[model samples]
Target: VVTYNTLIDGLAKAGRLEEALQLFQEMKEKGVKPDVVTYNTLIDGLAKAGRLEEALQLFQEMKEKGVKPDVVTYNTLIDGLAKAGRLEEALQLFQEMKEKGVKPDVVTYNTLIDGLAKAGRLEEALQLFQEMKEKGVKPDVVTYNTLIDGLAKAGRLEEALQLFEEMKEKGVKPDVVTYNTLIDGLAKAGRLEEALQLFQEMKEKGVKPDVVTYNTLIDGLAKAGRLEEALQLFEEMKEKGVKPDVVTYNTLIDGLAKAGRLEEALQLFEEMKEKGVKPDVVTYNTLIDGLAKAGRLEEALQLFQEMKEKGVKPD
Candidate 1:
């Protein structure tokens, strides 16, 4: 029984939902009882894999078996439902949980808030945030970050900044992800100065810059035609030992291409290859399209050939 449950959990974690279900059935056939944790694991796996109907069925089965659902079980289903963008169903589940006297925890609220925010349902997300606090479920860093990210993406920079301040006031420390989210938002809004200020503050507060931070700033500068500034930041990123990833290279290449600096973009592409970074279809497509735009059809054809030789295909 222990071995079966352990393997079931392993399968679910690996996202092998079918295999996990098979194991579950086998366990049942052997007359081995499944516990709450077992059901929770399978439910989470199904939800994450977008098998919500199956997950709900399992929930119903658990209830029929008289195995009471715990907070984790509720959380697993709620998260799955939310992630599937069935927010209405998820909210209904939340009410059911409350009626059943299952007190929702911070994780429960955080999951729903994140889902709603991601769906651009900021107003709904905020309402839930307020309800979470009123219920004594203190908002965590993740809760604040989700709200900030959603607001920023919606061009509500001021609201995001306010939430950042509120998060600080609540004694929640900002992490690297928090700063990256706001920086991206500010940059997108053309508030480069404010973005830079926040970037400096992040460093001063000892929140280390990650690759995403630099990529966001670089993309913003590139889009604004401030290639010099973007290049400078790229150099600074290297100085700080943050090796550029494919995303970094692709952004720069696209910028150069857009600037009619096809040769420079090709040079960067070569540098990427020299650094053992395999060029994906996007990389090749950018170069090909850039060359075609520059009336270098022959060069574009050459790149297209190279892409094929490298077994890269486009949809």
Candidate 2:
């Protein structure tokens, strides 16, 4: 029993479960009195690795041996079932855990919330949102993040932001995932004004926005162009030392080109190649084509000259 406990737990954690299960078989042949820790360790390894059938079989056998399952054992199997989208069975396990007097923890609730959200059971997911607090379990950022995002998309915008407000009330500072999600939703709903407000709020709240924030705004501005706005943002992007990637370059280049500022466009092109950000096919074509949009014959002439200098233009 000790050898199987030590060897199997070690082997299973090492991801050598094929050999570990063989070792377990050897224990049974010797009529070894394997206990809860051995079964629980094996179950966790199998569950995490998605060997659900074998894990559950071991789950049943442990109980048959009157080796009482603990919270970890139930938690592991519930997670496996949850991830497999066997949510009905997973929920049943929740009841089983309760009846068996094993208290579920934050990790268990987080896993259940995710599974419920994914299965489009948002109301039930929200029940846990309330249930966790009533049961005095603190929800972490992952829990709050999942609930808000799921609620936001599931047509519960008011309640999502209500939770957003409450997160601060509960001392849960909303993060990039939280801000980006709401910003994206607001942007989509033509609430660009509000979305922009959130952008500034995120920054002021000491949460640094990522490349996604800039990309989103750049796309937004591109849709409603003012070379002036693009112009200022391009400079600001550089000053932030955020290192303008290809989108920053390509968008500003096109904006400058479209504004009949062909000289500035070509100037920025020189700086970009010098800056060593390679132009992809779309932007490469845009460098040539934005001049077409500008449509003065002088600009077309300038395009020919620029393309000529960068001859055999590469991606």
Candidate 3:
């Protein structure tokens, strides 16, 4: 049973859902009764694959089998439901869990909070955040990050910033993701100065910049028409050994083409290939649109044909 359960988990993680489910049935046919862990594993796999109905059925079976659902089981189901955008169902499960005397831990609150925020139930999410606090559940860095991202995406920058301060005051240290999220939000909101300030703070606090950090800052510079600064950042990114991806090329290429620096953009496009970074549909589309708008339709057509030859069908 242990070996089968582990195999099922491995299959689920590999995204071979059908095989996992088959193995699960094999276990049952062999008269090997599943434990809560086995049920939770299958439930999580099913839920993640958008087979929530099956997952819920399994949950029912678990109950019928008298295998009491544990905290992990509830958290996994809630996370899956939340990710599947079945927030109401997830919320119902949360209430049911409490009624069943299952104590929700920090992960439970974080998952539900993230799901609620993603579903634009910001008010409900905030209430739950408070409820977690009232329940004496210690909020961690992840909890704060989720709320900050939620508030930031909802254009509640002031509230997001307030949460940032609250997190610091509570002595929870912010990580690279915390800085990146805030920086990205500020950059998109056209508060570039503030974003840059955070970038410096991240460095000062010894948080190493990742590819996303460079890409976000570069994108801000690119959109702001500060191409020189953007180029400088790009070079710095490479110098620091952060391999730029398709998004990086797309952002710079789109920006340069918009700025009428088609030559530089084209050069970068070629460089992307030379550097072995594959151009995706977005990369092709951005370049095509830029070329088309710049009256370089011939070059755009050439790219279109290249895109097809490279097995990338355009949208």
Best by TM-score: 3
Task: Provide the TM-score for each candidate, comma-separated.
Answer: 0.82, 0.56, 0.86
Which pairs of residues collide in model 3? none
Q: How do the candidates rank by TM-score, highest first?
A: 3, 1, 2
Question: Candidate 2: deviation at residue 197, Å?
Answer: 3.4
Those runs of model 3 whose alpha carbons end farther than 4 Å from true positions after fitting are 1-11, 22-34, 64-66, 296-315
In Å, residue 282's CA in model 2 sits off its true spot by 18
| Model 1 TM | 0.82
Between 2 and 3, whose lDDT is larger?
A: 3
The per-prediction CA RMSD against the true structure, in angstroms, equals 3.4, 10.2, 2.9
Residue range 156-253, candidate 3, lDDT tens digits: 99999999999999999999999999999999889999999999999999999998899899999989889899999899999999888888888999
Worst 10-residue lDDT window, candidate 1: 306-315
Query: Candidate 2: how many backbone clashes?
Result: 0
- Summarize candidate 1's per-residue lDDT along 1-315 as a digit string, tens digits: 678878988988898878999999988899998989889888888877878898899999999998899989988888888888788888898899999999999998888888888887889999999998888899988888888998988888899999999999989999999999998998889898889898999999999999999999999899989999999999999999999998999999999999988889999999999999888988888888889999999999998888888799964
**Model 2 residue 173 lDDT score:** 81
Give the alpha-carbon lDDT of every model: 0.90, 0.79, 0.93
